[PDB]
């Protein structure tokens, strides 16, 4: 019943990095619409002194995914990764920007 604060639309990658690098908690994130790949979504996440970027992929059925698990919406992909690491390399959990 309220808009998701993590959806920032078409903001440049550099802009997302500037904003997230200022965040204090690992996991602070946002979903943006990629410029380099029009029509694609990108997930930017604060982690330590860096900002990691993940590309949201879509399968033949139209489901969104990052690695192997599939989702019926960006909304479900995001909520799923609030409890399950968004990265297969390090343990990183999505947290709302503050």
């Amino acid at each position: 019943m309220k808009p998701h604060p993590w959806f920032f639309g078409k903001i440049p990658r550099a802009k997302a990095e500037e904003m997230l690098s200022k965040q204090r908690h690992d996991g602070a994130f946002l979903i943006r619409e990629s410029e380099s790949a029009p029509g694609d979504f990108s997930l930017s996440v604060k982690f330590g002194n860096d900002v990691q970027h993940f590309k949201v992929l879509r399968d033949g059925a139209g489901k969104y995914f990052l690695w192997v698990v599939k989702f019926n919406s960006l909304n479900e992909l995001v909520d799923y990764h609030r409890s399950t690491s968004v990265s297969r390399n390090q343990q990183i959990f999505l947290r709302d920007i503050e």
């Binding site: 990108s42 990691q52 970027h53 993940f54 590309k55 992929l57 990052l66 690695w67 990265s87 297969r88």
Partner: peptide
């Protein structure tokens, strides 16, 4: 991208 990390996952790519």
């Amino acid at each position: 991208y990390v996952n790519v």
